[PDB]
Amino acid sequence: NPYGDNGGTILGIAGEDFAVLAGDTRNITDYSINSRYEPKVFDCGDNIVMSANGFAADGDALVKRFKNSVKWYHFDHNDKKLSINSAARNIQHLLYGKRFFPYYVHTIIAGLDEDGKGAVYSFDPVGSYEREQCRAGGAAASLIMPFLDNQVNFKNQYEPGTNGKVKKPLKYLSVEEVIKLVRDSFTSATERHIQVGDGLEILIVTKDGVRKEFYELKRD
Amino acid sequence: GYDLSNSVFSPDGRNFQVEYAVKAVENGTTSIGIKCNDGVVFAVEKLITSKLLVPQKNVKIQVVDRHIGCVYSGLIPDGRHLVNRGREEAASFKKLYKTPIPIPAFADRLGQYVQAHTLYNSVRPFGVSTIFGGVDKNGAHLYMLEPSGSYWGYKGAATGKGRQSAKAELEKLVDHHPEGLSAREAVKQAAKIIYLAHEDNKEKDFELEISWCSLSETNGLHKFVKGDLLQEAIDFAQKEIN
Amino acid sequence: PIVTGTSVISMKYDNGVIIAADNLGSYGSLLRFNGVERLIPVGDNTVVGISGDISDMQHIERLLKDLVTENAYDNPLADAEEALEPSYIFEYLATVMYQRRSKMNPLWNAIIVAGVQSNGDQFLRYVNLLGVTYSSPTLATGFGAHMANPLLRKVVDRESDIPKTTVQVAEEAIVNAMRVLYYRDARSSRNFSLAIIDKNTGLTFKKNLQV
Amino acid sequence: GYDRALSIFSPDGHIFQVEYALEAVKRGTCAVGVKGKNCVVLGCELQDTRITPSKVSKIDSHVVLSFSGLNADSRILIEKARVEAQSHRLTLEDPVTVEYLTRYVAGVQQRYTQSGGVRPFGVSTLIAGFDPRDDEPKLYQTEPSGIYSSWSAQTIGRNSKTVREFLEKNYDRKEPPATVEECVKLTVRSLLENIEITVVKPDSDIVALSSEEINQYVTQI
Amino acid sequence: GYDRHITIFSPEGRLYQVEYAFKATNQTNINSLAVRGKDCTVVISQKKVPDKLLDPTTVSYIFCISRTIGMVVNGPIPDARNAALRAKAEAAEFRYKYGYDMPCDVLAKRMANLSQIYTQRAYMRPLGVILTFVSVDEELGPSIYKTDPAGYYVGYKATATGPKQQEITTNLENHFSWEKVVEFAITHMIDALGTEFSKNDLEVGVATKDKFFTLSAENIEERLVAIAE
Amino acid sequence: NYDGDTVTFSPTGRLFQVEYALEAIKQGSVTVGLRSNTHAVLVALKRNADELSSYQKKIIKCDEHMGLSLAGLAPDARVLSNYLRQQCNYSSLVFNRKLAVERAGHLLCDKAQKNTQSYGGRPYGVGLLIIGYDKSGAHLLEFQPSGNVTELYGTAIGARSQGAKTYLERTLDTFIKIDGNPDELIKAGVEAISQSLRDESLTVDNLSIAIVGKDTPFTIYDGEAVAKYI
Amino acid sequence: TTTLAFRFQGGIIVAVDSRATAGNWVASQTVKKVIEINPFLLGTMAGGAADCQFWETWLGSQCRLHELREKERISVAAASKILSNLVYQYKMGTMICGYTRKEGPTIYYVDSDGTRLKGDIFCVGSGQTFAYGVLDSNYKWDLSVEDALYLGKRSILAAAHRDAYSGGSVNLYHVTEDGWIYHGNHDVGELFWKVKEEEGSFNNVIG
Amino acid sequence: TSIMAVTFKDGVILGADSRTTTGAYIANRVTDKLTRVHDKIWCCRSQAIADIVQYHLELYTSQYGTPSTETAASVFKELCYEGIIVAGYDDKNKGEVYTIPLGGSVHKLPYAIAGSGSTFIYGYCDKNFRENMSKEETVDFIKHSLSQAIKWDGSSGGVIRMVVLTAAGVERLIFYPDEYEQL
Amino acid sequence: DRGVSTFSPEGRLFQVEYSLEAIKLGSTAIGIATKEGVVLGVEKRATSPLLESDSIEKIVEIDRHIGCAMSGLTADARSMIEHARTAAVTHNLYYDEDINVESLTQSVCDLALRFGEMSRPFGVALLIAGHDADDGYQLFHAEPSGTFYRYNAKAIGSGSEGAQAELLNEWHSSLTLKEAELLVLKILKQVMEEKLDENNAQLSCITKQDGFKIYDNEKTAELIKEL
């Protein structure tokens, strides 16, 4: 078997002027802990943060090849900043280059679109990609995304007294509120998932640049 | 009209392209090799074409594996090509077997490679003569390989522009020391011989580069002569001129 | 594997890294070979500990010597600021392992590269036959990752514990873990090798240490 | 593999092999093509007439190809053109347009002028026909260099200059030959400065005129 | 005009490049002779080492192709070493393929066929060497087979190669343990060339039933002393 | 008789095709390289075909730590720079190691030499000055079609480069000790290249400057960015 | 997943759902299952989404190359033939929808086994039966543009209601001779209640 | 099979049984299992690979001189890696034993045992082997060990063939069951 | 003979110089880049009155905002243009973005010296005109030597010697697009042997709003009247 599971869950949320990519720092094999701090969210330059979740070797290979492609793009276009959509197309081509022996990874890239709004792209191991407002990857994706849908997009929430006829209107979430929600969802996942814990690394992409925040999770 | 292609015999049976490659070798700077009682010393004259050259940084002598040193005169890129082939050959020997390649075996491999460049008109003969050698399980060996692919073992070897005077000095060395030279005194004498041979190229300044591979001094590994020993050899050579 | 090496355990202290492995090559349940050195010094600032297939370990040893020889070529600073780093050696080994796995011809080993970088940082990283790499304050392979890792993590639980850990404490923990592994691992040996890479005192290789 | 550069630039900027292939073309027999409003008429001036191939060759049901120069090279060109037309039908579901087929043939000819180990075709082709489901006539020409262009009337082979002068004085691009009779009579008059005539009509209606019709046209002239 | 530069026929039906390779065979100015005893084959080759900087033990035109076959080459040492390496590979490959040691004549035919290929293909030049193979064949006994740049080979009762090969050849014709055969060959070479030999002027190879080997300078001096007595 | 192929030696042992490839550089515009212990500077005189045309790019950037300038055939320079970028890329990928300037120069040496001994190819018609910064400090390399790669304090290649080279030789002891003041080293390079002009003067469009150093990534100055150095 | 495309007097209506499921886990409710190959060509994804996406983008590139060479846009038949040959040579269900001057409104169905069918109505996916029945019961050629858009909406709504792996929202496309028009995203949750209120259907669902 | 090579004061002795079986059937009971790959380098399996090794070593002898037992083991590994006991004598190494178990790793040992019968004599050989044994002592040790292995292994039997590799040369010894069984 | 990849004693490749002299015999092409667009004009040079001049495509589209003119052996120009179109389409496929004009010119010129035992270099010169957000309206002159320059105004072909001097005299940074059309037509009329009209000359322009377009004979005739 050339593949394996090293655990790990990632979360990319695109705001109106920011993008956050968060992942737990625990590396595991079966029921053992390999490392309590093995980052899987990487600033790849040009205000683009990438995370390749799944098979750790394939994730490392894909991240390395994407960084190589960004370097070659800078070599060919005179240090021109790579746009997030161009990066997404490049990652699609990189993934499809191994169609029949695929990178066993689901990768998420986050950043700002050319208009300045937060952009998040999710990729299938075979090469399909889609721009999303939010996407969760990894084992604990099912323990995190419903809560964010409830809390960011106000799903199943209605304005009180309207008899469920008026939905709760959407609102601008600041990056701080989004960070609070990410922290709470990851703490819940740590509580209920044995592969989540040991620390939460969040990379925030704004117009200023890429900002990294680390928060400790429970170590059991 | 037999000198325009590599693999053509002249009516006398000569390969004129190999002779022209030898002329190119004779145009090069003087490099020597001395086989001491337990090792080999390589010295080369590095012409200082301009004051802007970084001193002690344009290294000519090359190591193959860890026990073989190679120095050459003529077309330096051809010598580098030959040394790259020799490194590949030593690696292949050390992969198929486990011992480091013996010096005679390495000499044969290089000779075969150089001779293969005289077999076709689609390729050019090497424009270098390589002095190479080292220490193996059978002791120290010194070889000089010519553009034809010919190579022999030598007690002392010299090529380049000042090859004649260097050969005379090496002959004097062989005559005066039948007992076998010592590695350190061999380094000093290599400095002396290079300085003496530079008189045929006195129009320009030169930098002396020495390396050695001795069973006792360098533990059978090829190392460059630097620091106190290099300066000592330089002073010995300068004094020996007068 | 058919002839196999057991656990390699390692940790980093305030001034360097310690790596240990035992000198036994098992043949199934037969304790066949007892002179197998599985710690491989590369240069003076790197030790490579290999577990698993012994023939593949010998192949990796040959590759490491070839890497040192190749680095020495045309490099007057090969014994100097242009020497091979633990990170370079690990990157090469991980590339080799990943390319072997991608060709479905894996080198059936787990490698820990231990060393100190030129700037003085401790290097301690792991790679296996799948190409999976990770770093930790303490690393162990096979039976070590299950039994010795808990004992070493009691000494260095996180990165902030590394500067508080002296060489004596780390070596004592490593020797205790080796004794425990001898007690509870059937494919282990009394005799083991221990290497200390210190940013100040350099590489210290201790052979034929006994539980 | 033999890859000597046979077609190279002379000091004056000329590729001599292409010029000599053009000379080989100019020593070919004839290919006069007169395009009208609805007609494209192609003509040429102990041999066994039954089995001697006609110079006009159907590349597909709607496109025909006449040529001038080396017949043996023309066979290879026509085979490649037919294979390409069939492949285009197979993969793009559509029969080739006259311009597409002309472009492919000229591309093969151009490829033979800058590939090592080969000499250019000594063939110039007059490619005539109608695009699928279309009705405006097409009359293209290719040359050994790979140049292709569209013509109202064109001739290639020996006496090409004289016949081209005759066409330039008798053909008027203001008012092209109105009837098939006009197309055929203009072609026969050009060839009279033995006659074979092929009329290409839309919807794959390609017919070679009988000797009786050609005799009537000649007698009228 | 280019018939003299590649191996194609001249208007007289000759291959001038092959003839020029024959001319090149004598560049080294070395004479060799091979003689068969009833039990052994002996090759005597001149050893001219004029440069005093040379290591004489490396100057050698006699090669041990296999356990039983030896080869002495007349011609430049790079082409000689090329032929020696090819012959060694052929001998080892024959042993691998057919389960027994290659006979001397089979190897000589092997190398002559290679020379014929060089003679017929334009991009390969001939090797300017003459190869003399000697062995004691387990079927045919002592054997001398000599190959030339033309791809021609034949077995010999005795043979001589070099610039003065004619003198040695007529001397052997007039005449017509291995130590005695060596002494005979050395004496006859002395008589033919009219030059006394020191222990450093000669190369000696001996093909016996079990192995081919070359004598050292001490053994050659011993044979010279025996001739002196 | 001997200049038609790179595979032929002249009776005196010369390779005429390689010498003609060198003459190709001698026809090119002058570019000047010089370095101190901390910084390496490329100064290039860009050439324009017509006053309605732009000036051809002379300086190429490999990565943050290395870059080169060209004299001669621009497509050859592009091919060599692509190969150099591939080598640095391979080093970074396989070893996480920044390729040393000397090793990259030797790789260029081998690639250039391969075209001087085999039939069918031609020598590269371009010369290169490679500046870089690695663990051993600032490096300046001169590449030649013959395969010769040399490490120098300062150098000039192209048309009339002899004046610049003579000035650098005269100024050597001054500019090698400039050290941590990059603007002064760039100034010295500008004077060196101005020593090689005949009729045209250094202008905003003519001059192109590159620099790399200890805490200086490889940066190229063009346009108004060089007005302070003119 | 439920994708449908039908042909009517006003062109082609393409309606899809947007739910992607990893087993029983709904990974996304906002997946685009319609490929804008070019301003005049649409493709639909139903299984094998990555192969579909990559190869239909490459089909768009091939169409652009054909445009440049022949000064004419590629036909729906040609694009479907290229995609079918590609699928066969590597041997999903995709609809190629376009409206060119020669062919008119044209839909081709290409699946993973290499079949290539021209037709007026197609439905693919886990909910293809419910949508296919809704179409068969309500489809007409003389259908108006508004009625055809509502019919596509309604068929996708039926599929999403009855099939567990279909839902999320309806993406409506209208292929015209001037190129396709996106008619928006319609949440299945809101659409179901709206249709239940206005239409009187789904009487077994308490509201 | 029961094969065992022992280094002693004057060189190395390779000993083996002579039985080859196909299940319970003894197909050959006079098999010669000790195989010469070079003049004084011998190997034994616990056959094509032996031919290729002999080919490579003959090439090595032609080009680079006499190979050592280490060179033979290196060739064996490079062919197998991409159970063999290799024993040989060289003047400087004075007799070496290299074992290459099924995995393809190479180990240099004072003595080696391999085959289905070596398991029964692991303890006996550990207890009874001594460094720097005499030639007769070494022959006796191999005789006793192989006799026990033959007694306990059904796939081992026949005569005990021995090859003595020393500076004197190669000596072939044969021991019939009537002699070693009564030991 | 001599090798195709041979250097001359002056450091110049023989075949490249011969190809340039081949280009010198081609039909004239003129390009002018302004702040509002780039205007490309070519001399048709129909060899016969029976030749349908509307079939002469000496200005082609590479991408939506990239077009070029050709001069010399225009049969090689078709292969060059096919490579350029493939490069632009492959760029859009791999990067989801339109190729840069300078990058397209580099991709084209990478083929220039890829010949030796390709048998020969191309015998055609291109005037590549394009627009992008990075550098605006750009005009490049691609040569078989592999070199290209950005030009404000450039003329290639048989009449380039005087046409370039006239462009030098006439071009300024404040020219409007219509002034560029009039200037191109004026230079063509000056250098063409034939009397210039809408049937023996062609015009094209690249603008951000409308992309690459070729002017019809009607519109070209209206512009010709303005002279």
**Is residue D13 a part of any domain in this protein?**
yes
Number of domains in chain D: 1
- What CA–CA distance (Å, rounded) separates E61 from D88? 68
Assigned token pair, G157: 């709504």
Distance between first and last Cα of chain E: 59
Would you say I87 and I98 are in contact if contact means Cβ atoms under 8 Å apart?
no
- What CA–CA distance (Å, rounded) separates D196 from D45? 7
Tokens 């790789």, located at residue: F107
CATH numbers and ranges of domains, chain H:
3-181 (3.60.20.10)
Distances (CA, A) of A214 to A37, A217, C192: 10, 10, 39
CB proximity list for G126: less than 8 A, separation 6 or greater: G1, G2, G163, G164, G165, G166
Tokens 């993934």, located at residue: A95
Q: What range defines the domain where residue D60 resides?
A: 9-220
CB count within 10 Å of CB H55 equals 17
Q: Do B53 and F150 touch (CB under 8 A)?
A: yes
Give the relative orientation of helices B103-116 and H48-64 as an angle to the nearest 10 degrees: 90
CB count within 10 Å of CB A110 equals 32
Which positions of G are catalytic? Answer: 1
β-bridge mates for residue D57, sequence order: D65
Number of domains in chain B: 1
Instruction: Nearest by CB to F95, from C75, C88, C118: name it.
Output: C88
**Is residue B1 a part of any domain in this protein?**
no
The domain I7-226: what is its CATH number?
Answer: 3.60.20.10
Is there an interface between G and B (3+ Cβ pairs < 8 A)?
no
CB proximity list for F42: less than 8 A, separation 6 or greater: F31, F32, F33, F59, F67, F68, F69, F129, F131, F189, F209, F210, F211
Which positions of B are catalytic? Answer: 29
E79-113 residues labelled b (16+ CB within 10 A) or e (exposed): bbbbbbbbbbebbbebbeeeeebbbbbbbbebbbe
Classify strands G11-16 and G169-176 as parallel, antiparallel or unpaired: antiparallel
Radius of gyration of chain B (CA): 18
Q: Do B63 and C76 touch (CB under 8 A)?
A: no
**Min distance E107 CA to chain H CA atoms (Å):** 15
Resolution (A): 2.4
**Is residue D166 a part of any domain in this protein?**
yes
Domain ranges (residues) in chain I: 7-226
Residue G21: phi, psi to the nearest 5?
A: -125, 135
Instruction: Nearest by CB to G32, from A99, A124, A130: name it.
Output: A130
| DSSP symbol at F174 | H
Judging contacts by C-beta atoms under 8 Å, the chain F residues touching residue C92 are: 94-95
Number of domains in chain F: 1
Would you say H1 and H17 are in contact if contact means Cβ atoms under 8 Å apart?
yes
Assigned token pair, E208: 């016996």
- What CA–CA distance (Å, rounded) separates I173 from I163? 18
- What CA–CA distance (Å, rounded) separates I1 from F72? 26
Assigned token pair, B230: 């290099």
Would you say E87 and E135 are in contact if contact means Cβ atoms under 8 Å apart?
no
**Min distance D111 CA to chain I CA atoms (Å):** 9
- What CA–CA distance (Å, rounded) separates A195 from A137? 13
Write F90-98 long-range contacts (CB < 8 A, 24+): F93/A64, F93/A68, F93/C95, F94/C91, F94/C92, F94/C95, F95/C88, F95/C91, F95/C92, F96/C87, F96/C88, F96/C91, F97/C85, F97/C88, F97/C91, F98/F65, F98/F134, F98/F135
Would you say H42 and H163 are in contact if contact means Cβ atoms under 8 Å apart?
yes
Residues in I lying within 8 Å of G, measured between beta carbons:
61-62, 82, 85-86, 89-90, 92-93
- What CA–CA distance (Å, rounded) separates B97 from I160? 69
- What CA–CA distance (Å, rounded) separates D15 from D143? 14
CB proximity list for F19: less than 8 A, separation 6 or greater: none
CATH number of the domain bearing residue G181: 3.60.20.10
Would you say D68 and D123 are in contact if contact means Cβ atoms under 8 Å apart?
yes
**Min distance B156 CA to chain E CA atoms (Å):** 6
Identity (one letter) of the amino acid at D196?
E
Identity (one letter) of the amino acid at B234?
I
CATH number of the domain bearing residue D202: 3.60.20.10
Query: 180-219 in E: which are within 8 Å (CB) of B?
Result: none
- The chain G residue lying nearest I96, using CA atoms, is G57
Sheet holding B31-35, edge to edge: B156-159, B31-35, B39-47, B206-214, B222-224
Helix (H, G, I), strand (E, B) or coil at D104: helix
Judging contacts by C-beta atoms under 8 Å, the chain G residues touching residue D148 are: none
Would you say E136 and E144 are in contact if contact means Cβ atoms under 8 Å apart?
no
Residue B76: phi, psi to the nearest 5?
A: -55, -45
Which helix (DSSP H) or strand (DSSP E) does residue I203 occupy? strand I201-207
**Is residue D15 a part of any domain in this protein?**
yes
Residue I51: phi, psi to the nearest 5?
A: -65, 125
Q: Where are the beta strands (DSSP E) in chain B?
A: 31-35, 39-47, 62-64, 68-74, 128-136, 139-145, 151-153, 156-159, 206-214, 222-224
Q: Do H103 and C35 touch (CB under 8 A)?
A: no
Three-state SS sequence of E22-73: HHHCCCCCCCEEEEECCCCEEEEEECCCCCCCECHHHCCCEEECCCCCEEEE
CB proximity list for D128: less than 8 A, separation 6 or greater: D33, D35, D40, D42, D63, D64, D65, D66, D98, D137, D138, D139, D140, D200
Instruction: Nearest by CB to F110, from B5, B21, B84: name it.
Output: B84
CB count within 10 Å of CB H62 equals 20
**Min distance F63 CA to chain A CA atoms (Å):** 8
Radius of gyration of chain G (CA): 17
Classify strands I153-156 and I29-33 as parallel, antiparallel or unpaired: antiparallel
CATH number of the domain bearing residue B167: 3.60.20.10
Helix (H, G, I), strand (E, B) or coil at E191: helix
Would you say D198 and D64 are in contact if contact means Cβ atoms under 8 Å apart?
yes
Q: What range defines the domain where residue F120 resides?
A: 1-230
Distances (CA, A) of B52 to B155, F33, F133: 37, 11, 18
- The chain H residue lying nearest E89, using CA atoms, is H59
Sheet holding A129-132, edge to edge: A42-43, A49-54, A105-112, A118-123, A129-132
CB count within 10 Å of CB E214 equals 18
Tokens 């003519």, located at residue: F206
Q: Do E23 and B12 touch (CB under 8 A)?
A: yes
Would you say B159 and B76 are in contact if contact means Cβ atoms under 8 Å apart?
no
Helix (H, G, I), strand (E, B) or coil at H175: strand
What region, left, alpha or beta, does residue C125 occupy, with left being phi > 0 and alpha being psi -120 to 50 degrees? Answer: beta
- The chain I residue lying nearest G60, using CA atoms, is I93
Looking from the CA of C202 toward its CB, the CA atoms found within 13 Å total: 4
Judging contacts by C-beta atoms under 8 Å, the chain G residues touching residue D97 are: 70
Assigned token pair, A203: 């990379």
- What CA–CA distance (Å, rounded) separates F135 from F103? 13
CATH number of the domain bearing residue A204: 3.60.20.10
- What CA–CA distance (Å, rounded) separates A154 from A152? 6
- What CA–CA distance (Å, rounded) separates E148 from D194? 69
Tokens 């145009």, located at residue: B27
Distances (CA, A) of F202 to B62, F190, I225: 43, 9, 46
CB proximity list for G150: less than 8 A, separation 6 or greater: none
- What CA–CA distance (Å, rounded) separates F72 from F81? 14
Would you say F31 and F129 are in contact if contact means Cβ atoms under 8 Å apart?
yes
What's the CA angle centered on C73, arms C70 and C75, to 5 degrees?
A: 125
Would you say A71 and F63 are in contact if contact means Cβ atoms under 8 Å apart?
yes
Classify strands A210-215 and A200-205 as parallel, antiparallel or unpaired: antiparallel
Three-state SS sequence of chain C: CCEEECCEEEEEECCEEEEEEECCEEECCEEEECCCCCEEEECCCEEEEEEEEHHHHHHHHHHHHHHHHHHHCCCCCCCCCCCCCHHHHHHHHHHHHHHHHHCCCCCCEEEEEEEECCCCCEEEEEEECCCCEEECCEEECCHHHHHHHHHHHCCCCCHHHCCCCCHHHHHHHHHHHHHHHHHHCCCCCCEEEEEEEECCCEEEEEEEEEC
- What CA–CA distance (Å, rounded) separates D160 from I128? 37
β-bridge mates for residue F31, sequence order: F44, F157
**Concatenated DSSP letters for G59-70?**
HHHHHHHHHHHH
Assigned token pair, I19: 């190809």
For residue A50, with 0-12 CB atoms within 10 Å meaning exposed, 13-18 middle and 19 or more buried, which class applies? buried
Q: How far is CA E132 from the centre of its chain?
A: 3
Judging contacts by C-beta atoms under 8 Å, the chain G residues touching residue A128 are: 49-50, 52-54
**Is residue D162 a part of any domain in this protein?**
yes
Q: Which of B232, B138, B221 is nearest to B184 (CA)?
A: B232
CB count within 10 Å of CB G14 equals 27
Give the relative orientation of helices I217-225 and I177-191 as an angle to the nearest 10 degrees: 90
Using a CB–CB cutoff of 8 Å, tell me whether D20 touches chain G: no
β-bridge mates for residue F72, sequence order: F126
**Min distance G70 CA to chain D CA atoms (Å):** 7
Looking from the CA of H70 toward its CB, the CA atoms found within 13 Å total: 10
CA atoms I162, I163, I167, I170: torsion sign: positive
Q: Do I94 and A89 touch (CB under 8 A)?
A: yes
- What CA–CA distance (Å, rounded) separates B173 from B156? 9
For residue G113, with 0-12 CB atoms within 10 Å meaning exposed, 13-18 middle and 19 or more buried, which class applies? exposed
What's the CA angle centered on A177, arms A175 and A182, to 5 degrees?
A: 90
Assigned token pair, D133: 């489901």
Q: What range defines the domain where residue A61 resides?
A: 9-215
Q: Residues of G marked as binding?
A: 49
Using a CB–CB cutoff of 8 Å, tell me whether C123 touches chain A: no
Q: Please, after which residues is chain I broken with C–N above 2.5 Å?
A: 117
- What CA–CA distance (Å, rounded) separates F150 from F212? 19
Residue B62: phi, psi to the nearest 5?
A: -120, 145
Would you say B170 and B32 are in contact if contact means Cβ atoms under 8 Å apart?
yes
- What CA–CA distance (Å, rounded) separates C203 from H148? 48
β-bridge mates for residue H93, sequence order: none
Instruction: Nearest by CB to B3, from F11, F151, F155: name it.
Output: F11
Domain ranges (residues) in chain E: 1-229
Judging contacts by C-beta atoms under 8 Å, the chain B residues touching residue F10 are: 20
Radius of gyration of chain F (CA): 17
What counts of helices (H) and strands (E) characterise chain G? 5, 12
- What CA–CA distance (Å, rounded) separates I203 from I207? 14
β-bridge mates for residue C189, sequence order: none
Q: Do I48 and D145 touch (CB under 8 A)?
A: no
Helix (H, G, I), strand (E, B) or coil at E147: strand
- What CA–CA distance (Å, rounded) separates F165 from D72? 64
Distances (CA, A) of F73 to B55, F3, F108, F119, F173: 31, 19, 16, 20, 33
- The chain F residue lying nearest A78, using CA atoms, is F61
